[PDB]
Each structure stands twice: as structure tokens, then as C-alpha cells.
């Protein structure tokens, strides 16, 4: 068993975490439990405070002079570690290994919260990633309001994710009538994995004398961003410009294969991606699972995926929503290019 | 007389805009990281610094009542830089308001097209447009020796007399209409669209930079409205009669309030920043550890 460790530049504070991927179940988020190690000194008349903050950084300025930081908080939780719920197995083992100067902290995440989604920065950028980020900050203070120096503090980036549900969803179907040009479309399944190809049926029948001459199929990413007002960003991640046509009073059935990936969608600035601990690259942002009916507006970034087929008549289009998730890992995701450099 | 207060305003603007704009340029162009929120303010400070550097020539020209002993080149250049500031500052404020509106409302566009290269292109376009608009002022003005005084004036009495008194009218009409109405109306529309469209109207009040932009916009509008209003009133009632005696002593106040505007910005930054007031008065890497089991 191996646990993560980060220390402050001062060298008097260190936060021990055992995992950095706290999985969000639709109604129960995993708890952020850990242990902070402090010298017998440096705490004679002070207190240890651990703060878990979720931010929605939307600009790479970071200038705390005139409000030019663009690091608005979304959920702030504060706990008291040094001044004295049952401890978990990880906290008990960490305390025994470290010693008596080991104070455990536990955070509970309320449900219906945004996950770690970071927009694609772009080639010529040297700033922080834009998106929802979860930050674990531990410092030493006795008033909870005095300014804390960067040297005398510990900051750790944790990532909350959602994985594919065990039970597969219903098969997506769609059909619209236009004047008739009946267009039917359906996928093979509802839950898809990253890199797994998507098969769509474009079985279409035509009855009018008008003839189509172009079939357009695309997979679009629906990143609902809401901080000041409700906004929706639609970016296509897959493209297939077929040149199939159907004669009047005849049918046409075909199966098309699509696969979204980041190699071609690299120049698309602002594209939603998974949470990034560092400047390393990550795959496309997964979908966001939300409670049915019992969920209000989620202030943050919500990622949705819809594949559409369009009959360019000279247009009739339908929407097929699908779910893109990573499968449940065995041990843990590394959050890094495993063959670095 | 309103001449002494005009001199006081000019001197105050110079002394309060040289070092403030200098330090703003130093912070936003040489120390802070280049990101597109303070490049507009850096260009604003550059324009203000150029205008205040050319201001002492006009200050000396006006301290002694009406006499310009410098060459015709400086006589053209000081007015050219004055109009260049007058247009570039308001254009930069307009693009600041547009960038703010796009960033807060419709963030999809602002998350893809808000590149630093686009900012440089916009800055270059603004500078070229301001220079093109101010060029007529650079070309028309010259010097004349009247009553044993060498004074600068706009040569609207060029060789053709029929076209004279019309070139001035169309020139000042274009100047006022564009440089006042278009930025002010666009900025008012942007601000009225920011409000009534952002739900839960308390996120804007929460000590963010919205007030920083709003204060600068309000100060600029307040300082530059009397000059334009007086100019348009003079245009309207100039051909009627000469009964307006207060107009002669009225426009010197605005001509100098608009100049103190160029220096008010550092004072506004000081006022809206507590920490900057305080100074004015004066990461490791993640490792890993074993676990027994």
C-alpha cells in the first residue's frame, strides 16, 4: 500500500492522502480523509486548519490586486484537525505509522456538485487551466481570517470523477417526420467508453419527389457552462461527411462508425476535457450523471454528448444522446502519461 | 478669470499622470505576465503618457496668453497626440466593455477567440484607426503671426474660400458623432445587457473587477461629456449670434477637465484597492510514502 505525500516549502506541514480520485456516486460522494503531520513546535498557541475548496477558474490571470484572479469559489469546507466520528482504516494506519503528532481530517462532499472538468487551454498558453477544480489546502492559523503565505501552506489538487454505471441504459432511438422523409436513427447501446467506436443506424425511407444528395453525421459535445447565466457550448468532436443519396420512393439503410479522440480535436480551444492535476494532457471530458428530477441547476460545467444525423435536402436532423464514461479502474487512474517524456 | 484654474488643472494633470502612468506601464508591460485583461489598460496608460508628455508644450503655450514659439512640427504634433489620446482611450474602453460582456455573457465565444494574438490584432487596429482619425488634425493646424503673437490655429481657411467654414463643420461633426455617440451608446448597451440578463444579481457585486471597469467608465464619461456638449452648443449657436459670452470662459474648464481625466486613472486604482493603499503609504512536489499492512 502506497499513499501520496506533499510538503510545504517551509517544511513544517505535510498532508498524507491515500487516494486522489474520490468517485462521485450519484447520491453519495466519497469522503476526503487524510492525515496532516505537524512538529511539536510551530503549534504551541496556533491551530491546524484544512480547507477543501471547489473553484471555477475561468481566466488565467491570478492577480490579487484588483479582483483579477478569476478563481471564484463554489464550495468551501473547513475543519479543525489539531483541536479535538470514527476514523477510517486509512487514517488509523497513517496515524500509527507517523506517530502521536498526526491529526486526521475528513471532508464530506454534498451531492449534486460539478465534477473536475477543465477546458482545453490551447497551444500558445502558459497559464492555469480553465474549469472546475477541487483544491485541498492545509495551513496553520488561529483566526481563520488572517492572510496565509504560500510558503506556510500546503496545497493539493484532488479530482472527483464519475464512472460508467453497471446497469446499461436503454437503447437510444429517434424518428422525425417531415413533409414524408421519415428518418430513423439508433445506436447499438447507450453507454460508451473512451476510444470505443460508436455505431449509428441511418435507416431512412423517402416518399416525396424531392431528392437528398448529402448525409452529414457528427458527434457533438454539449458543455453547459453556467456561472453568471445559463450558457451552452456545442463543439463537434467527431465528423463524418458521407456522400450517400437515396432516390425518391425508396429506402436506405446503412451503419456508420464514429470514434471521438483528441488527436484531431486539438486545435479546438475551450473544448471540455477531464480534470488535470498538472500540465499533462487528458482525454475528452466524460458525461455528468445527475439526479432525475431532484437536481436543480448545477453551477459549473456539465458535459453531455449527442450524435446527430442530418439529411441535407436540396435539412432533417435528429439527436441521439449517449453516455461516454471510463470503466471502473482496478487500482486507480494515474492522472499522468504513464510513459512520461 | 478661468485661465489660472485651467493652468492649475493642466499642471495637476501632468504631475499626477506622469508617474502614475509610468508605474502602470511598468507593472502591466514589464513585470506582470502577459494575459488579455491588462493589455488594454497598458495601452490606455501608454496613450495617456504620450499625451501628458506632449502636454507641457501646450502648458507653456497657454501660460503666456497666446504665443507658440516652437516649430510648426510640434504645433501639429501636440494636437495630433491630444486627439490620438481622446480617440484611443475611448476606443480601448469600448473594447474593454465588449470583452467584459463577451467573457461574462456568452462564454463559449470568449473561451475560444480570446487569444493574446487576437488582442494584439485588436490593439493594432485601434491604434491605426485612432491615427487615421487624428490625421486631419495633424495636417490642418498651422501657425499664424497675429497681433505680434505666433499662435497655433486650424487652417480651415485654406485656398478655396467656398469650401471654408464647411470643412470645420463636417470635421467636428464626424469627430463628435463617432467619438462620443458610438462608444458611449455601445458601452451603455453592453452594460444594460450585462444587467437584467445575469440571474441572481449578487455575483457581480461580490467585490470583483466589475467595479474597477465601471469606475473608469463613469469617470471618463463624466470628464469628457462637458467638452463635447460645449463644442456642439458652440456649433449650434455660433451661426445665430454672439450673445453667448459664457462660452468663451466655459470651454477652458472642460479643456483641462478632460486632461485631468488622463491622470485620474491611477488615483482611481489607488482608491479601489486597499492593499495598494497599504503599500503606497509604506511550492514543493508530491512524493509518496509506504504503509504497513
Amino acid at each position: 500500500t502506497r499513499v501520496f505525500k506533499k510538503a510545504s516549502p517551509n517544511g513544517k506541514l505535510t498532508v498524507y492522502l491515500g487516494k486522489r480520485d474520490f468517485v462521485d456516486h450519484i447520491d453519495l460522494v466519497d469522503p476526503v480523509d487524510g492525515v496532516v503531520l505537524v512538529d511539536p513546535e510551530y503549534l504551541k498557541e496556533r491551530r491546524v486548519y484544512v480547507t477543501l475548496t471547489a473553484a471555477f477558474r475561468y481566466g488565467r490571470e491570478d492577480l490579487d490586486v484588483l479582483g483579477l484572479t478569476f478563481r471564484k469559489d463554489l464550495f468551501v469546507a473547513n475543519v479543525q484537525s489539531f483541536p479535538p466520528k470514527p476514523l477510517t482504516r486509512l487514517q488509523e494506519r497513517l496515524i500509527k505509522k507517523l506517530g502521536e503528532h498526526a491529526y486526521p481530517f475528513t471532508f464530506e462532499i454534498p451531492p449534486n456538485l460539478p465534477s473536475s472538468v477543465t477546458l482545453q487551454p490551447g497551444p500558445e498558453d502558459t497559464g492555469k487551466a480553465i474549469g472546475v477544480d477541487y483544491e485541498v489546502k492545509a495551513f496553520v492559523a488561529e483566526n481563520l481570517e488572517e492572510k496565509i503565505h504560500k510558503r506556510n501552506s500546503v496545497r493539493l489538487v484532488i479530482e472527483k470523477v464519475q464512472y460508467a454505471p453497471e446497469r446499461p441504459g436503454p437503447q437510444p432511438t429517434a424518428e422525425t417526420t417531415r413533409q414524408p422523409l421519415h428518418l430513423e436513427a439508433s445506436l447499438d447501446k447507450e453507454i460508451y467508453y473512451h476510444g470505443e467506436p460508436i455505431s449509428v443506424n441511418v435507416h431512412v425511407t423517402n416518399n416525396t419527389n424531392k431528392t437528398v444528395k448529402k448525409i452529414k453525421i457528427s458527434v457533438r459535445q454539449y458543455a453547459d457552462i453556467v456561472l453568471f447565466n445559463t450558457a451552452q457550448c456545442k463543439v463537434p468532436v467527431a465528423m463524418e461527411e458521407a456522400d450517400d443519396t437515396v432516390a425518391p420512393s425508396s429506402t436506405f439503410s446503412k451503419v456508420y462508425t464514429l470514434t471521438p479522440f483528441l488527436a484531431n480535436n486539438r486545435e479546438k480551444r475551450g473544448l471540455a476535457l477531464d480534470g488535470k492535476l498538472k500540465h499533462e494532457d487528458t482525454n475528452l471530458a466524460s458525461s455528468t450523471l445527475l439526479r432525475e428530477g431532484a437536481n436543480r441547476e448545477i453551477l459549473g460545467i456539465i458535459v453531455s454528448y449527442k450524435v446527430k444525423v442530418k439529411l441535407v435536402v436540396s435539412d432533417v436532423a435528429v439527436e441521439l444522446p449517449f453516455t461516454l464514461m471510463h470503466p471502473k479502474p482496478k487500482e486507480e487512474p494515474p492522472h499522468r502519461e504513464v510513459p512520461e517524456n | 478669470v478661468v485661465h489660472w484654474v485651467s493652468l492649475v488643472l493642466y499642471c495637476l494633470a501632468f504631475v499626477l499622470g506622469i508617474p502614475g502612468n509610468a508605474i502602470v506601464i511598468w507593472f502591466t508591460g514589464f513585470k506582470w505576465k502577459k494575459t488579455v485583461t491588462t493589455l488594454w489598460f497598458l495601452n490606455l496608460a501608454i496613450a495617456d503618457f504620450i499625451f501628458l508628455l506632449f502636454l507641457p508644450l501646450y502648458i507653456s503655450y497657454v501660460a503666456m496668453n497666446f504665443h507658440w514659439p516652437f516649430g510648426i512640427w510640434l504645433c501639429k504634433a501636440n494636437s495630433f497626440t491630444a486627439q490620438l489620446n481622446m480617440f484611443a482611450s475611448v476606443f480601448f474602453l469600448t473594447v474593454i466593455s465588449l470583452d467584459h460582456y463577451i467573457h461574462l455573457i456568452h462564454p463559449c465565444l470568449s473561451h475560444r477567440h480570446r487569444t493574446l494574438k487576437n488582442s494584439l490584432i485588436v490593439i493594432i487596429f485601434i491604434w491605426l484607426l485612432a491615427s487615421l482619425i487624428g490625421g486631419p488634425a495633424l495636417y490642418f493646424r498651422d501657425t499664424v503671426e497675429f497681433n505680434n503673437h505666433t499662435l497655433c490655429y486650424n487652417n480651415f481657411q485654406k485656398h478655396d474660400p467656398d469650401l471654408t467654414l464647411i470643412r470645420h463643420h463636417v470635421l467636428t461633426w464626424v469627430k463628435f458623432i463617432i467619438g462620443y455617440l458610438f462608444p458611449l451608446l455601445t458601452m451603455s448597451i453592453c452594460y444594460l445587457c450585462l444587467i437584467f440578463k445575469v440571474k441572481k444579481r449578487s455575483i457581480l457585486i461580490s467585490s470583483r473587477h466589475f467595479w474597477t471597469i465601471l469606475v473608469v467608465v463613469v469617470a471618463f464619461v463624466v470628464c469628457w461629456t462637458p467638452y463635447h456638449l460645449f463644442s456642439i452648443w458652440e456649433l449650434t449657436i455660433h451661426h445665430n449670434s454672439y450673445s453667448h459670452h459664457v462660452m468663451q470662459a466655459g470651454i477652458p474648464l472642460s479643456t483641462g477637465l478632460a486632461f485631468l481625466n488622463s491622470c485620474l486613472n491611477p488615483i482611481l486604482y489607488v482608491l479601489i484597492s486597499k492593499k495598494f493603499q497599504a503599500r503606497f503609504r509604506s511550492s514543493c512536489t508530491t512524493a509518496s510514502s509506504s504503509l504497513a499492512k
Partner: nanobody
Amino acid sequence: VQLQESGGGLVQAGGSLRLSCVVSGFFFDTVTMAWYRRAPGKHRELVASATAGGTTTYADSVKDRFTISRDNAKNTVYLQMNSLKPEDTAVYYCNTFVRSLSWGQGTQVTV
């Protein structure tokens, strides 16, 4: 940044050793330093520590046997051992009580 430890030796039971470790790149003036060891085939446990000002602490089977001193002139802390036990063999590491600094290569001592 760089931690070099020396002072090992194949000293039999009842002997004494004078171990030293140099911490370069870290200014530990108010920072408490400690000493850690691994028995062959076991995990690392704290064996001694000493606060910045005046207080030094030890583990259970360390009192009246081991002593720890620190000197800020050369940025080096000392760990002297007396009356070595047959189980005292281990690999001793030099680091902060917080374990903030990167771990170095310890010294092998056997009895």
C-alpha cells in the same frame, strides 16, 4: 535538497558510533529534525528526534541509550549511540520530523 549520511561501521555489541548527516539546500533553524531506521525486512519507524529550541524526544527503547544533538553552524545534526543491542542493526536515515525533504541513502550498521 541533498542529504548525505555517514558514520556507519561493523561495530560489535556494546560499541559506540558517531553518525553525521548534512542537509544542503534547506535552512532548518526553527525546523525539528528526526532520525528514522528500517530493520532488515521491516518498515521505517522513528527512533529519535530533537526540536529546534531545547527539547529532544526519543522512542520507547531509546531513552538512556541514544542521544541527539543539532548544530546550525554547519547545518548538521548528530546521533550518538551507546550500548548497542543485538537488534539495533538497521539503516538509519536523516530527514525532517515532518518528513518534508526527499529521502536519501541511509547508512548500514550491523552488530
